[PDB]
Amino acid sequence: MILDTDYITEDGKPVIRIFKKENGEFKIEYDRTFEPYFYALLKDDSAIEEVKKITAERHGTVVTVKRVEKVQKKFLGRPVEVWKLYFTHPQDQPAIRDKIREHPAVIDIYEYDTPFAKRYLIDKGLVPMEGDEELKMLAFAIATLYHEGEEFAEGPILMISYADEEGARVITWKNVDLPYVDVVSTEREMIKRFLRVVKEKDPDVLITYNGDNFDFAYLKKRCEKLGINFALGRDGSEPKIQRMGDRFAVEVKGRIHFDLYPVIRRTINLPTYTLEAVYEAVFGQPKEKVYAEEITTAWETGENLERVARYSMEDAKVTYELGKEFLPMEAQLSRLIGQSLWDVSRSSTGNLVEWFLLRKAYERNELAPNKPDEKELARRRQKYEGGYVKEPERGLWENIVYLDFRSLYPSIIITHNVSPDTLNREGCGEYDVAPQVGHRFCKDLPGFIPSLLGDLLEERQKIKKKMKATIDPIERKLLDYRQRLIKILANSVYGHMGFENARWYCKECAESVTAWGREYLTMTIKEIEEKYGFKVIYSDTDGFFATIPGADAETVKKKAMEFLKYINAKLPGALELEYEGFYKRGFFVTKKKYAVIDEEGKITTRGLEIVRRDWSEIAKETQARVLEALLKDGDVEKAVRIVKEVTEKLSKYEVPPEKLVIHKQITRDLKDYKATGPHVAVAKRLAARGVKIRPGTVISYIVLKGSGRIGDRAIPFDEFDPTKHRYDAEYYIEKQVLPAVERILRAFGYRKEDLR
Template sequence: MENMKAIRRIRAMLVDIDYRVKEKFTQIILLMKGKGRMFRLYDRYEPYFYLDAQTERIHSLLAVVARDSTDSRKTARATRIEPVKKTLGGRERELLKVYCTYPYEVPILRSAFGKYPAYEHRILFTRRYLIDHELVPLKTAVLEVDSKRYVQKVISIEDEFIPFKTVSFDIETYNPMGAPRIDKDPVIMVSYAFDNEKDNESGMLTFRDCGKKSFVQVKKNEKEVIESFSGLIIGADLLVGYNSTLFDIPYLTDRSKAIGAHFYLGRDKKPPKVQKRGNRTKIRLTGRVHIDVYPILRFLSTIGAVKLSRYTLEEAYREIIGSQKLMVKRLAIHAMWDDDGERAKLAEYSRMDSTAVLEIFRKILPIEIEISRVTKTPLSDASISLAGQLVEFELMNASQEANVIIPNIPSAEEVAERTRNPIQGAYVKVPVPGVYDNIAVFDFRGLYPSIIISHNVDPYTRNCGCCGAGEVHVSPTGARFCKKQVGLVPKTLRRLIERRNKVKDAMKRALSLLGKETQFCQMAKSAVCLQSKHPETFGERENEEVALLAARNQVLKILNNSFYGYLAYPRSRWYSRECGESVTAWGRKYIQDTIAEAEKEGFNVLYGDTDSLFLLLGSKTEKDALDFMKKVNTGLPGTMELELEGFFPRGVFVSKKGAGEKGARKKYALISKEGKIKIRGFELVRRDWSAIAKQTQIAVLDAILKEGSKEKAVKLVQDTIKRLEDGKVPLDELVIYTQITKDPKRYEIMSPELSAAKKAIQRGVPLQKGSVIGFVITRNGKSISEKAEPIEFAKDYDPGYYVDHQIVPSVLKILEELNVTEDELKGKGKQKNLGDFFF
């Protein structure tokens, strides 16, 4: 009775999870968010794995005391072993479930029991807990807990999200040598921005006067600045930075050691901990969560949710928020700090960095919330996960629900073997280069996911044995898949697609109530930037609801479209070459069959690629095209469906370099009836093309597609060339950005980017593998590499280079389809009338 009185109910949201080893058990630590601050709950949880061994072996296995091969002081012993029924390889089997006390014992026991096949012995302990329990990160739970805050029972899980108290931050360092030196160069400014309910509170800590700025707190010295920042964030739940994992936090940590400052970011007042997740790095704080926006944007850019050619804070802010933030030259920071007149501007710049990070974070938070919820992944891990990992997390959760053994991580030898022979890709019918009118574009809705579901493609439905010769799905490669028992992969994928359809319906209903139905298509494509350009669209509550729905839709889309890639990924737990080959083979079959059917119906097929089909209407009508689509759909299996993307009045398709009469894959531009230009494969989002080349290219496409004017397009190019030759183009429009893919010191061939990188390093700019170097081709030097100068140090530019290697190449392939030559672009040839070529 006394124990019952100690039980109480609480309502809180799971934010993060960790564990610690106690004297006789392993304690799970659950970081929860209530209506006030964060707090901890606890649980007891036993590590375990599975052995494929006979029940008779239980007694002898329990007697084994194993020692760690690398540390003889560590021993391990199974606390209990029980026989269980699990599905393994598509069939139900009896396995042994081996329990122990501590997570580190699992690999020791697995090694000691090495003669028996083992399963689920390499699953992160905290993920194992989430797989086995009802709790879902960033969903609110009603729980029963005892007086020591141990969870006794989960009463319910609800979708309610409890808002965080968030603070963003950024640091500036003294840098007379370009790169700051930990032993010599101080942290001169620490800026911050709090996300309050009513308004933002931003400020900056420093130790020199900054012109009486109201947001500036001037401390005695660097040590006091760092320690004041640690105390400043005491009430925050989330600490958000930009590249803070690799720069800000490590520099603050190391600099604090150098000057004897007490630096901490967690509620335990201890330094941050660095953890590795594969090739990703994570900063763990006690009592709050650190989020780095930088890797999130890289991931979102990779999957197409945002479009960034560079990952600087300035570019991200411009693209996502739609505004320009205050800029200063990085290498001038130390000089601005030493200049009493310039220090105030540096303070404004520093503060704006923090507010910019916070604004960007607000836009991407909904999608991070939904990644956490859908895949049962803590926010700190969701922010550094890749698409394949999210698929793996979802399949792990589904395996537990279905009582299926999770496949093991492949060995290095298995990965190497899988990598040797790549899987044949999609079918492509390349276009004949040219400018075309009246194009109908169709695509198969989720082609690869549809194939997986419709044909039950799964590593464990192959050669099932339960279906007769004529009762199986036979792929074009000859692989056979069961028709009777649905595999885990297609079952999970179907469930996700059904969830997404429900979310899309909910979005439509919400928008309908608000009278904003026309915005559905835009919102369904991206949850990011949703409110940046139309902040007046909804009220605050509706804003949050619709943004979360749009984010959930985007996350489910990411997952659905990533299943095929995960099946074919050599490091995947669910890798299957036969599955990967079958999916692409069926894909080639369906697109080729559809092309043949279109030609049979009298359409001229312009282009086909993977899951898309471009038809020239010619004398056909739009109704004829829609009737063709309906006819194709009547013959498709399962969930497969051909959809109309749209009718486009005009499009331009260019040739591939050295391909002669053949067109390039995924390199075209179309204009819709509404006047919007859709561009694929051109230089607009490439880093290694200057801004002026990109601007010229889009202007040329605009002139051709919107106005049908070759003359205007040619004049645009000629005017740009003249501006270049007259020296009237600003240097910032001429910067070429290239990512350094190797250690700059190990490059053997002297390329322009390497030359610029070496010059930057010599001047103290920190560059390494993965860094992006921005450079301008100047007049100083003989070769292009010699002329490459980092943008920070460039004084002039070589107009001949930009004409011959940037402007002309960016537009020539387009204008060649109108019989325009390079000489004509340079003002040396005679132009013909557009009507001779266009209509």
Template sequence: MVAGEVRELEFWILDASYDVVKGHPVIYLWGITESGERIVVAEKNFRPYFYLVPENAISDALVERVRTALHTFKVLSVNAIERKLFGRTLNVLKVTITDPRDVPKAREVAAKIPGIRDVLEADIRFYMRYMVDTGISPSSWVLAKVRSAPVPNGWRVDEFFELVEAPRSLDKKSTPRLKTYAFDIECYNRYGEPDPERDPVLVISRTGEDGTVIFSQDEGSSEKKLLEEFVNDLVQYDPDVILGYNSNRFDWPYLLQRARVNGVKLSIGRNLGEPSQSVYGHFSVVGRANVDLYDYASELQEVKVKTLENVSEFLGVMKKSERVLIDTNKVYEYWDSKDKRSLLLRYAGDDARSTYLLGQVVLPFGIQLSSLVGLPLDQVFAASVGNRVEWFLIRQAFVFNELVPNSRERGEETYKGAIVLKPKPGVHKKIAVLDFSSMYPNIMIKYNISPDTYVPPEEHVDPSEVWVAPEVGHRFRKHPPGFYRKVLESLLEARRRLREKMKTLDPRSEEYRIYDERQKAIKVITNATYGYSGWSMARWYKREVAEATTAWGRELIKATIKKAQSLGLSIIYGDTDSIFVQFDEEKIGRLVEYVEKELGFEIKLDKVYEKVFFTESKKKYCGLLADGRVDLVGFEAVRGDWAEISKEIQERVVEIVLKEEDPWKAVDFVRKTITELSEGRIPLEKLVIWKTLSKDLDEYEVDAPHVVVARELKRLGYRVGKGAKIGYIVVKGAGKVSEKAKPLISVKSPDEVDTDYYVKRQIVPAALRILEYFGVKEEHFSTGRRQATLSDFF
């Protein structure tokens, strides 16, 4: 393209950033063209702004006061405009200044101007403000009129452009071919968690389209050379997406510190910059998307101990049996041993490969979530669910001419939640689970529940003009449609259209997969909106919104249960938006028809358990599906604070009970495991109990086992503190458990293990959570006495 030539350019936005050049802000959109070129498009004409809400009517004198007070910030304009705040029309002042870096200070000054009641939208990041205003989204295609310009010196892009007109969003669902690069580091750790000021990086492994490469401090090498090789390799590979696992919390801060120690610059950004910590704790690599897959894994409720190998196995990308596994506390031993070092290198390579394969599974969803909520791909997983919902609402607020309320800290307010029925304990055959489709969003739509439709108790209003929530009495105007209602209706309609389109596509096609990930992203944001309304950090916070929604939800579940019982359906259990009933196809069909036609909500048959077992406790059950899969909800096996042996015991006990219908076979299995434990045949790693330090060590007043072990680790030179996961094994000896807890690294032989503790406090309790219902008692694990069979309990 000829320099200075103007043309239309279609590109996909990978990243966004801004800089101030010669006193003027420049927004950079880093993208990929259809032909695969990596480009930068610069916007030089957009300027930061915020709103001032006056106490009274806007006057010329007020405008002049504002200009005078803010004169040091190079004010470009102060204009009176009309906007809405919580649905009420306001006349406000829009203040536009020159430098986005001045906005925080200008906000403080503006808040003190006489006649100004509030300052709004001064805390929205500059490049995000630009995307909101133009309606464009990251991870999406846009069309822009641009002028070609020289590529800045050294920048790692194919072409550089300047915007002639603001870009516009394109309704195009495809994704360009992204080059991904997964990496992992191994550090010397003789004293436990490595210290970046003391302990060197030993190995950096990476995987890309061209395979796996391992850099290490072999003979004659050095850490400095290792770091330089990593930087050169990454720059030469030139990835669009950099994948890590816990890289924002560990790998990047560690590498940056070691780079400083060695005098190496990690210049891996496409603008030659180093990784730098940004919002939500993530590290930004300008021009690329740095994605920490641990952020995604942290929301996987099904995986309680979220190691890379556990998550990789759960998502089906790499089985533990297919890779090298080592005790990560002993990396230094593998490094120091010439015989073991090759195993460490293979382990590092497997970590990089697992991360790369995990990225191929996770990124399609991340891309659609990014495009939907407007957060760049490198931020969308790092952000909390509340933050994702909020950015989607901010974008919608601009569309509906609504002002964005300020963020502010509030104390937590509790309110009555969903209905949870006490289950009928025992084993039940052929149980159907009926789920309401998007129950809370549909309740909010039907009753127009929104912060801007809420009517305070002191406000008089015609009763026919409001919906009144059952139990709690909160009132919401029936008209006009509230902010939440408009947003949720648009989301549900968008998802409906996508699902209709999917019916016409080949499920094996790329287009089908993109539409599927998109509808999943919409579902996540739609269902999270109710929770957001009661989140104390929310801009659009309103406790009454969340409280009224759950109240109507309880009423809906009660009405459904009453109808089910009148039809002769036996109710086994109910929780939030689902009920468990005895399977009867004809009666279930009539119940579904009633809920949809009479109550106005959609309910569907979600699954049918061949057998399901309930204890007397709520939210605890295990069910067997027709395909042989077992659902385990609420038991120790899905909690992270029990030893691995307890989880394995409980999972196997459930499987035997439900599949073989003989609790005494399960007892035999437990007895066999106890024998293996007493003979020292259970690996020590399966006996480790993990607990997280929820505060700093000096804040603990009680000597809990993990606290005692953490203090011992600190005495030995290990780095421990708030947030650290502490693993301990209970060994033989007298005294309390805290006096017998030892770090895993200090236990050398299974002979040291207090088998009596593990039998009585871990293995037997885990098994009895299931088996005690069938008449099994603690003594049966030693006597093996047999009583009834499972058939006696139906």
């Protein structure tokens, strides 16, 4: 099983390393035969003698094109003759690529920025994370002496914790008497001891929570300020720091550092992403939080240091428990994209698609197009029409079916061969014309994009089937992961075609796909209402909610299944409508915002405040109860009563201040803000105290009783002391709770005055 690839330089020559794990043994395979290269498309196929001769300087050394070779590749759907330029070392390419492009005889260069170790995986056709090898994992967390003001790592690492299949342990230098704590003399002997552990257990995966930006760098600064060699690598190296955008990421050679923090946020939608919040939201059981003010006082006084030890052990224990959960899915993404788990676990959706496309492009001998430069990125800033959304027949509906298309956009690309390489091709024999936008797509040869999506959706439907044969719950989950992933990947391949900075950008392709989707959806809605007597209650991009006005449950289901047979026989090719559920009742407030309950009482809510992370809990909790009494028993009087009980709890300050916290994330640097809302205003006064306010941090503020702007009486929640503060009951009554339930109960005649 391949884990990762990199390269070293032996006497100026690149040497690929492949970090494998086979038969429970860690092996390092070397390849000294791979040559770096990129492509060049010249004006004449004869000037290459001059192109052989361009040189450049790197590090007191002239860089030269080693060898050249005539290649025929597929570019723009037609075979073009391209020139392959071989080099000695990968770092030669950036030092010479511009000197080549600037040559008049060459029009442009291609595939000049693909990293060596990743090109190896693509060209050599290798796929990491495949096989049945069980990787040895080990989590770790630390505890630190913090004071306000002192620079990063000014103080010491008080304790280090770790956890695996043998349990969790703690290592510190102050004497803490507990069965899972190991005491040593000093910090050195602690960090040195922790190194002895990792080297001894030899884990393939090092699991952390935010180790990319804290744990490893703290262990770095002390190790130098103290004089230890952090030989965590299996080659005897130290943790290697990279630059993942504004923030950083940490690699551990020979192993996979799995920072759960990027994985969690990108996967789960939580108002806060603390360890205690993430743990309790994934496993249901809560987790205690000891703060930095406590562990510093507990250290300098020596009092209640055992409480710090429990938290330290808990941190390591829970991150391991979380790592065992989220890693196997991240492994499937690695196999699907064809890049290391370390890379795909922190990659944006766009970059994951490009890597998938680049591998696909290499398999089909498709010369990859460059990324756009400034002028092209300026052009590609347009917009195009997307999915159709109807205005919901606002109110309460009964006996509803939801009919939806199977992968509507990827099925359109497949059915109509939508691809940049099939758009407006001359000499076409069979073409398909896009509605509204009139773009013609050649069907003589299968397009690049349709051929990949076809293989993906074919593999998706293969997985949704074999899953049923398999019995082991793990294989069910593992396989199910690939099923959902293929879908996100497929839709992102569509989104790639409209992406400003995408290599296979094609606005015509992108807007043709949506144009067909509008036609197929509105056609289906036309048929079901005219040829079958339905009334479409609400419809988003790929499906709709409909019912027979009046009628009975089965009558709605029977005619719905009849309509499906009629419409799926009239639907061209890979296009298909499916029965995706019956629902006893359903409330449709507005576009993107509705709630629905099935036959068994499962309430599904979409878009409403109850699901939005930037609303107070007291607002969600009561809208949930109002929706419940509305869809569970239709008890409108109990629903209107509930609003009256909670509104009196607020005015009498009986509701816990924790339920009135609004969580909103800042998205940019505070100088770049043009509108200071309450959450930004709070984050600006925090920057006046010198706190880390970076893009991505969540502001959690409560509004205090007072007058003026909201941003003048909003304080962070960790700053709220109930004895000294009183929250603004009037604000949360008139601006949070009542507005959220009135938009629902307005359909029943009730107004806010009737709810206070």
